[PDB]
Amino acid sequence: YPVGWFTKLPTMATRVSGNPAFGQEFSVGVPRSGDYVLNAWLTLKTPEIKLLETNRLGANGTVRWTKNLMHNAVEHASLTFNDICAQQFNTAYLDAWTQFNMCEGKRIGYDNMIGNTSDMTNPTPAQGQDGARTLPSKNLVLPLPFFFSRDCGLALPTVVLPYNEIRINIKLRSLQELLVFQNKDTGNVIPISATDIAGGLADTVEAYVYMTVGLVSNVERCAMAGTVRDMVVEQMQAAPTHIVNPQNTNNVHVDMRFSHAVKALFFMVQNVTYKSVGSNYTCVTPVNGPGNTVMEPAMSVDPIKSASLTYENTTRLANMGVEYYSLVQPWYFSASIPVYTGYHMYSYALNVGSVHPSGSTNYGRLTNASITVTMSPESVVAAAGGGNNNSGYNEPQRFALVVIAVNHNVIRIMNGSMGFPIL
Amino acid sequence: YPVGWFTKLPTMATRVSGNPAFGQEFSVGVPRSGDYVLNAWLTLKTPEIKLLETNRLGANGTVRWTKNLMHNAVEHASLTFNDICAQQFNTAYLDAWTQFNMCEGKRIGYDNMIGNTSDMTNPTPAQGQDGARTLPSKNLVLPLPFFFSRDCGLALPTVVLPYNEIRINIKLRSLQELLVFQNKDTGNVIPISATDIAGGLADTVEAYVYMTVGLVSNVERCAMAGTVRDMVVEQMQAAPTHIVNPQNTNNVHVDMRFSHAVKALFFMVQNVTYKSVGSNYTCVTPVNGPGNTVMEPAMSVDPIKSASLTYENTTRLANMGVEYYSLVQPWYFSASIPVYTGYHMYSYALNVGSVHPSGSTNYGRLTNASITVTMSPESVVAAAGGGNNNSGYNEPQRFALVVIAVNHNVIRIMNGSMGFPIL
Amino acid sequence: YPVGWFTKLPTMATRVSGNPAFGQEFSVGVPRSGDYVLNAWLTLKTPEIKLLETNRLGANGTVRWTKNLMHNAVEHASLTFNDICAQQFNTAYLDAWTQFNMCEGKRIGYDNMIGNTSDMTNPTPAQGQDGARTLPSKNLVLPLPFFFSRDCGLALPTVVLPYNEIRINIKLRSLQELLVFQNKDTGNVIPISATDIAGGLADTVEAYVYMTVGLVSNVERCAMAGTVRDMVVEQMQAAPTHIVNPQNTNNVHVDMRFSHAVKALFFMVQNVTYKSVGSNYTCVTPVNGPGNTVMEPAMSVDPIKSASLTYENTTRLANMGVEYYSLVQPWYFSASIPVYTGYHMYSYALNVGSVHPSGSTNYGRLTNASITVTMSPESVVAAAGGGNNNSGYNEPQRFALVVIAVNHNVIRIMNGSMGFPIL
């Protein structure tokens, strides 16, 4: 004999603060008078202003060098809780979670709700992201994955502690693709000019944020706000570093430090403008003018040679190529597929979210942890292609080595006491 | 030390009643002398009688306007239990369950066992379903999803109550694609005539129904038929309505009423003949003669503008387009990619089949619930295309608004007592 | 208040024995001084030695008849435990597990890490597996699925019994595709000759085996090696037979016997060289010279007509075609799409790995079990194609009927006692 009551679950639009534009700080004030919060969603519309298709028009920019806009607009998304930075997001973490957790039908639908694919569409995160024609009326949706947006039993209640000031920050990007850019560096300097309609009539972006509010019956509402609840969360930790400039020799050895136990380590080398490009550009059709394809696949063409993780000043894995650390590593656990760009990961634990860590890199006693990245030299032009031994001018553009990790924490919920227990 | 015994699980062919033809009532008598029942499969062979490929032959009909046959033959499948209509199916529910529960590799294989794709095949429920050549010898399989065909622990036993008269009904359709139709309305009136071999040599359909029989060892057979078992089921509820005719203005406000708590609401606007067509037809090659592609994708081309669900005479969600209610809504709970036709869905609950409803629309106390559908006006010919603002003559063909919902019920099993508990 | 300790999980490279070459026995000695072992991985590099693309060059062999190398190199992988053959693998089981358990993103990534796909790539196990150009520098990875490589709670501990001698055997194959073969039988007899660079500069294969070692804290290490533990495993059982030669009539009735309860039966008819080819070859472009496509899809073109499983000298399922036993059967339990080659499967149980068999073919009391395979006659040349009624010379090449089954066993762990309990 089950017990059922009149339950509800509305989706009221949360308040916004600040004018959403290009390159500005946008704060979102999620409500706190409800029982428990769930997953959030973001809405950003970025229409193009092109005209012709993928045909070559000399030095004019058409629909051939287009990338995802909403995926590049985000830069940092920190979830502040009780005036304490619990977890923070970046541009590399938004693409790393798709190639790890999203294994079922979530990855297929992610390519259509992020990348503007109309003319010659392709359900892929990269390699062919051409837009529409003139003024495409559409909307883009990008959710924010959290540690309580996966199950109803692991949700964070807001009625038990209505005094905490929670707030998320969304940092937008001023540089937009297919609007003020067309090449790898600068395209004839087009800030707002309309050279044969290819950079004019630029419009701003609109941010429509909404957060659902949980509604529990009054029978279980009094018992929830008064009883001690020991919850388990999975926060994120990032540490942006710097990689050596591509030249004759490429070898780094920057140390990596964190806090408690870390499940796994993952990072991705990205560019400053076309961060979703793996292989080097080529001045041979059809690669760059006309650009029917952004870049060729095959991880062997990527300038990144190999890598090696350091642990306790001892070896951790055999010196394998990029085809094993980027493909086979996410294929073991969770069974997900990546993309030809420059991802790196290492399979470790097999249970994410439990009451006992069964194999986790406890960094509380470790005092030696670094990472190395081997790249390919240049000594070649950017009109012949790339590879594992030669790279054109599309290599010095990427120089940001941001490593994002995931740790496990326990939030102590107590009326009148706020402490930090064990990991 | 586990306990094992000699277990069996055969699949005996059940009996049939009635001659399977075109447009007739076909009853299936599932056995009841066994211990329990699982899933049932249906077999219907619908061979074509065409000759040429997708080449244009003037007014003659070839292989260019073909749709799925077994998916259109099913019209109503009601599962009668104890002379009480527990749940009923329709033509819209067979396509809505594919874009919801089928998230893994179930949707990819569903396109091959339903849609006849031979010449220029495409693993998709629509957009390119061309058949073979002359007399294709093949068979089609379409099972019936029930509330006890998902796990062995939630199966409905038949040995505990061998007095209930269970029977399922299969209503076939007389109108078959690529046999008596070729255009949107009537194609030169071809009832049985063979105009250059394009509608002759029509054959009937054969129905091969078989239901597996559960076999439980005698150690647990006596304890099952005698002990009270409180099982939880997930029935279905449908309510066919009527939408306004496409004209200058398109706005409806038909109320929707049900019974107990409903998990989520979903419906789909379908045509009378080519119900698997979303975008409007165009008289420009290659759309209609020759028809290499049935219709263009992009949800913006669909005549349906937007919708809004009513709850407690208050707003429920922001007025979003069709790209958000058809793509992002099924992307949350159970990420399953849909299709470009005209499906609507709203994410709500996150646990289907539990002992406690954690967020369900309890309709037992609600007295106000409606739905609205906004379409696009005409004022344009059917030879230029469709869109969100103009539609040709392919809009008045669809006028059936059948909404299918899912509710939760508890079947009280008692020897000598048959009552209805709570939801 | 959870309990956490400093845990580790290294991946030390295990020792190797024997020189890895073409057609030799390679033994792998996994360590046993650790706490528990997990999943293992294999590394085999098989570079091609071609030059031109898929262009026709007369009788010369180019890149048009290429198949997977690492999938064909393995032949028998037996996991010996305590000098007892617990389970054994074959070439058919490595492809059957992909079309069964691998339902999510595991099958998509399996096609890229097995089949050499560079020029005109295709994420599919067959139908288009062309290599690169000259000397492709790449590595292939193929793990070994076991009964303890699916979850951390069901892992086999090695610290509780450090006296058992565990060892796995890897039998390599001397016949390699795109090296000493180009046609169906013999291609102008090319053992090592380099006819216009198409079979010269042959290199050996390197085997890099590594097995991770489990590390548990000392608090739970003493309690694990001393207390009894009743674990449940899922072993494999194979039985290679022989099918009748393709002629005027094709009908077999070889009995099948095993041990305890079997979950399900599955087999696949494979060739001796191009075992990943289902449809018959055709001398019409583009099938064989130039070979842009290996074979056409559609299960109706396969020479295998139908089959029927025998159980207790009684019928078990209706005489359905190959489109029902190869597609609809894997579509039910664990929705995994197969491939067009000749795979057979029958859905039975729904729970794999539990404490109570809820429906298993207990062969302990059965004394009658056989299988039949119906094929198509010849009486046609190999230059017109295949089908369900006619087959060319590509039918007598396949004559190995190896049936692989899966059973359930219970390993009794006791210090000083080694017995066999029930199934």
Using H for helix, E for strand and C for coil, what is the string for chain A?
A: CCCCCCEECCCCCCEEECCCCCCCEEEEECCCCCCEEEEEEEEECCCCCCCCCCCCCCCCCCCCCCCCCHHHHCCEEEEEECCEEEEEEEHHHHHHCCCCCCCCCHHHHHCCCCCCCCCCCCCCCCCCCCCCCCCCCCCEEEEECCCCCCCCCCCCECCCCCCCCCEEEEECCCCCCCCCCCCCCCCCCCCCCCCCCCCCCCCCCCECCEEEECECCHHHHHHHCCCCCEEEEEEEEEEECCCCCCCCCCCCCEECCCCCEEEEEEEECECCCCCCCCCCCCCCCCCCCCCCCCCCCCHHHCCCCEEEECECCECCCCCCEHHHHHHHHHHHCCCCCCCCCCEEECCCCCCCCCCCCCCCEECCCCCCCEEEECCCCCCCCCCCCCCCCCCCCCCCCCCECEEEEEEEEEEECCCCCCCCCCC
Please list every residue in chain B whose beta carbon sits closer than 8 Å to the beta carbon of residue A108. Answer: 337
Exposure string for B52-67, b = 16+ CB within 10 A, e = fewer = bebeeeeebbbbbbbb
- Which two tokens mark A111? 């390519």
Phi/psi of residue C255, nearest 5 degrees: -70, 160
- Which two tokens mark B141? 């399989």
Integer CA distances (angstroms), A103 to A350, B335, C141, in order: 15, 10, 20
Neighbours of chain B (3+ CB pairs under 8 A): A, C
Q: How far is residue C122's CA from residue B419's CA, in Å, rounded to a whole number? A: 58
Mutation target vs A (from B350, B389, B412, B423; most A CBs, 10 A cutoff): B350
Please list every residue in chain B whose beta carbon sits closer than 8 Å to the beta carbon of residue C323. Answer: 113, 138-139, 141
Report CB contact under 8 Å: B7, C364. no
CA A104 to chain centre: 18
Question: Whats the size of chain C, residue-wise?
Answer: 423
Query: What is the distance in angstroms between the Cα of A146 and the nearest Cα belonging to chain B?
Result: 14
Nearest to C148 by CA among C44, C268, C30: C30
Of A334, A335, A355, the CB nearest to C2: A355
Query: What is the distance in angstroms between the Cα of A314 and the nearest Cα belonging to chain B?
Result: 40
Binding-face residues of B in 207-236 toward A, CB within 8 A: 230, 232
Query: What is the distance in angstroms between the Cα of B420 and the nearest Cα belonging to chain A?
Result: 11
- Which two tokens mark C100? 């069964």
Pairing of strands B361-362, B261-270: antiparallel
- Which two tokens mark A398? 């990427």
Query: What is the distance in angstroms between the Cα of C230 and the nearest Cα belonging to chain B?
Result: 7
Task: Tell me if chain B has a CB within 8 Å of the CB of C372.
Answer: no
Residue A230 contacts by C-beta under 8 Å, 6 or more apart in sequence?
A: A410, A412, A413, C1, C2
Contact A230, A413 (CB under 8 A): yes
User: What's the order of all strands across the beta sheet hosting B15-17?
Assistant: B15-17, B25-29, B167-171, B76-81, B84-90
- Any idea what the Cα angle at residue A39 is, between residues A35 and A44, rounded to 5°? 130
Nearest to B233 by CA among B350, B351, B408, B418: B408
How many Cβ pairs within 8 Å bridge chains A and C?
89
- Side-chain half-sphere CA neighbours of B347 within 13 A: 22
DSSP SS3 for C171: strand
Nearest to B34 by CA among B286, B246, B232, B212: B212
Query: What is the distance in angstroms between the Cα of B13 and the nearest Cα belonging to chain C?
Result: 7
Query: What is the distance in angstroms between the Cα of B407 and the nearest Cα belonging to chain C?
Result: 24
Q: How far is residue B53's CA from residue B365's CA, in Å, rounded to a whole number? A: 58
- Which two tokens mark A146? 């959290």
As to burial, measured by CB atoms within 10 angstroms (0-12 exposed, 13-18 middle, 19+ buried), residue B270 is: buried
DSSP SS3 for C150: coil
Report CB contact under 8 Å: B357, A1. no
Nearest to C95 by CA among C269, C323, C305: C269
DSSP SS3 for B10: coil
Residue B417 contacts by C-beta under 8 Å, 6 or more apart in sequence?
A: none
Which residue(s) pair with C40 in the sheet? C144, C211
Contact B402, B388 (CB under 8 A): no
Report CB contact under 8 Å: B2, C349. no
Contact A351, A408 (CB under 8 A): no
Q: How far is residue C208's CA from residue C150's CA, in Å, rounded to a whole number? A: 23
Q: How far is residue C275's CA from residue C386's CA, in Å, rounded to a whole number? A: 16
Q: What is the dihedral of CA C63, C67, C68, C72, to 10 degrees?
A: -140
Which residue(s) pair with C302 in the sheet? none
Of B13, B39, B137, the CB nearest to C318: B13
Which residue(s) pair with B233 in the sheet? B409
Contact B338, B99 (CB under 8 A): yes
Of C103, C337, C357, the CB nearest to B7: C357
Task: Tell me if chain B has a CB within 8 Å of the CB of C414.
Answer: no
Quickly count: other Cβ atoms within 10 Å of residue B185's Cβ.
10
- Which two tokens mark B60? 């003659």
DSSP SS3 for C185: coil
Query: What is the distance in angstroms between the Cα of A252 and the nearest Cα belonging to chain C?
Result: 23
Phi/psi of residue B296, nearest 5 degrees: -80, 150
First to last CA, chain B: 39
Nearest to B206 by CA among B77, B13, B20: B20
Which residue(s) pair with C307 in the sheet? C373
Exposure string for A386-397, b = 16+ CB within 10 A, e = fewer = bbbebbbbbbeb
Query: What is the distance in angstroms between the Cα of C97 and the nearest Cα belonging to chain A?
Result: 15
DSSP SS3 for C191: coil
- Which two tokens mark A365? 């006693």
Is the Cα dihedral B95, A145, A356, C213 positive or negative?
positive
Q: How far is residue A201's CA from residue A146's CA, in Å, rounded to a whole number? A: 37
Contact B407, B260 (CB under 8 A): yes
Residue B416 contacts by C-beta under 8 Å, 6 or more apart in sequence?
A: none
Element (H, E) at C221: helix C218-224
Q: How far is residue C166's CA from residue C151's CA, in Å, rounded to a whole number? A: 20
Is the Cα dihedral C378, C382, C384, C388 positive or negative?
positive
Contact A297, A207 (CB under 8 A): no
Q: What is the dihedral of CA A145, A151, A152, A157, to 10 degrees?
A: -40
Nearest to C383 by CA among C312, C302, C274, C280: C280
Neighbours of chain A (3+ CB pairs under 8 A): B, C
Please list every residue in chain A whose beta carbon sits closer than 8 Å to the beta carbon of residue C7. Answer: 261, 357-360, 362
Contact C280, C288 (CB under 8 A): no
Query: E strands of C106-248, at which residues?
Result: 140-144, 167-171, 210-213, 229-240
Resolution in Å equals 8.6
- Which two tokens mark C66? 């290429």
Q: How far is residue C292's CA from residue C297's CA, in Å, rounded to a whole number? A: 14
- Which two tokens mark B408? 């939760």
Q: How far is residue C89's CA from residue C236's CA, in Å, rounded to a whole number? A: 7
Mutation target vs C (from A102, A122, A228, A300; most C CBs, 10 A cutoff): A300
Which residue(s) pair with B408 in the sheet? B234
Q: How far is residue A342's CA from residue A269's CA, in Å, rounded to a whole number? A: 6
Binding-face residues of C in 41-70 toward B, CB within 8 A: none
Contact A286, A130 (CB under 8 A): no
Which residue(s) pair with A169 in the sheet? A27
Contact B259, B360 (CB under 8 A): no
Q: Residue written as tokens 């790898």?
A: A184
Q: Which long-range contacts (CB under 8 A, 24 or more apart) does C130-135 make?
A: C130/C54, C130/C63, C130/C64, C130/C66, C131/C48, C131/C50, C131/C63, C131/C66, C131/C178, C132/C48, C132/C63, C133/C50, C133/C51, C133/C53, C133/C63, C134/C48, C134/C49, C134/C50, C134/C51, C135/C47, C135/C48, C135/C49
Which residue(s) pair with C43 in the sheet? C141
Nearest to A192 by CA among A184, A180, A177: A180
Residue A277 contacts by C-beta under 8 Å, 6 or more apart in sequence?
A: A67, A126, A271, A294, A295, A341, A394
Nearest to A217 by CA among B358, B349, B317: B358
Q: How far is residue C276's CA from residue A353's CA, in Å, rounded to a whole number? A: 41
- Any idea what the Cα angle at residue B405 is, between residues B401 and B409, rounded to 5°? 155
Quickly count: other Cβ atoms within 10 Å of residue A307's Cβ.
20
Q: Residue written as tokens 């102008």?
A: C188
Q: Residue written as tokens 């002629």?
A: C247
DSSP SS3 for B262: strand
Contact C229, C250 (CB under 8 A): no
| Gaps in chain A with C–N over 2.5 Å, residue before each | none
Pairing of strands A307-309, A370-373: antiparallel
Phi/psi of residue C298, nearest 5 degrees: 65, 115
Peptide bond into C143 cis (omega under 30): no
Element (H, E) at C71: helix C70-73
Q: How far is residue C104's CA from residue C115's CA, in Å, rounded to a whole number? A: 19
Mutation target vs B (from C106, C108, C324; most B CBs, 10 A cutoff): C324
Contact A341, A268 (CB under 8 A): yes
Report CB contact under 8 Å: A362, C208. no
Report CB contact under 8 Å: A7, B331. no
User: Could you say which DSSP state residue B26 is in?
Assistant: E
Binding-face residues of A in 106-125 toward C, CB within 8 A: 107
Report CB contact under 8 Å: C332, B39. yes
Nearest to C310 by CA among C270, C269, C349, C265: C265
Contact B35, B161 (CB under 8 A): no
Contact B306, B320 (CB under 8 A): yes
Binding-face residues of C in 347-366 toward B, CB within 8 A: 348-351, 355-362, 364-365
Quickly count: other Cβ atoms within 10 Å of residue C315's Cβ.
15
Report CB contact under 8 Å: C359, B7. yes
Phi/psi of residue A129, nearest 5 degrees: -125, 50
Nearest to C243 by CA among C232, C251, C234: C251
Quickly count: other Cβ atoms within 10 Å of residue B304's Cβ.
25
Question: Whats the size of chain A, residue-wise?
Answer: 423
Question: Whats the size of chain B, residue-wise?
Answer: 423
DSSP SS3 for B417: coil
Please list every residue in chain B whose beta carbon sits closer than 8 Å to the beta carbon of residue C364. Answer: 6
- Which two tokens mark B80? 């009668």
Which residue(s) pair with A239 in the sheet? A403
| Gaps in chain C with C–N over 2.5 Å, residue before each | none
SS3 content of chain C, % helix, strand, coil (to 5): 10, 25, 65
- Which two tokens mark A392? 């054109």
Q: How far is residue A70's CA from residue A140's CA, in Å, rounded to a whole number? A: 7
- Per the rule left: phi > 0, alpha: psi between -120 and 50, beta: everything else, B218 is alpha
Report CB contact under 8 Å: B335, A151. no
Contact C195, C60 (CB under 8 A): yes
CA A305 to chain centre: 23
SS3 content of chain B, % helix, strand, coil (to 5): 10, 20, 70
Nearest to A397 by CA among A178, A245, A180, A187: A245
- Which two tokens mark C20? 């890895």
Q: How far is residue A172's CA from residue A207's CA, in Å, rounded to a whole number? A: 10
Report CB contact under 8 Å: B107, A105. yes
Q: How far is residue A125's CA from residue A110's CA, in Å, rounded to a whole number? A: 8
Phi/psi of residue C371, nearest 5 degrees: -155, 145
Report CB contact under 8 Å: C108, A337. yes
Report CB contact under 8 Å: B118, C318. no
